[PDB]
Amino acid sequence: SLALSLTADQMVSALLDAEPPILYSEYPFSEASMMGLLTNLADRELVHMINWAKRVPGFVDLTLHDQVHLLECAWLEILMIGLVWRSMEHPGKLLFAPNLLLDRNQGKCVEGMVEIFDMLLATSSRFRMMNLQGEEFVCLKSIILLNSGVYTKDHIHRVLDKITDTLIHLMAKAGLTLQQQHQRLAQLLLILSHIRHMSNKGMEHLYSMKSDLLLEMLDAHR
């Protein structure tokens, strides 16, 4: 695995270069129309996520079966932290696309998404109050890809240690003290527990709300 030999700055630049683009949605809403826009957007984002996963250092070194399992477990988590990251500079709103900026009242169009909408907004304000940097976001997103299905293995945890060395190396350049480094590291990783919670609650409605790829990704959680 050439990922373990990479330095911290080489890890950051490899993650920044592998970032998928910000897609647009199809140019008021109802229950079936908003779900149609979100489904169509998420279905097209899956194709970029799969190619983004191949460019995550160490992911190719896994077997094809292990790659499928990690993507099947974390695909909604990765979509959410990306949505939360895009919505950072828009307090009180979720930026699904540059032309699809929704607020709380739009979440009431479908019965049961207001609860997930508020948690996504709280996560965005949490990143916003932390002044989360792009180099930190791409590290957290790759951690989700490797960690979310690791217990359902020595190489993955070795790569996870590399991203931790990458995260600490990023905080040291920002001028944080030793105490501030492990505190911010702990703060960022505890948010992943809430991202997992949002994905579990969101997935729960998604395979009750029921694209063949998006169905195979959805059936993997049943």
Binding site: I50, K54, L64, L213, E216
Partner: peptide, 9 residues
Amino acid sequence: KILHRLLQD
């Protein structure tokens, strides 16, 4: 699985 196909292309 479609995920198998997209992970090899």
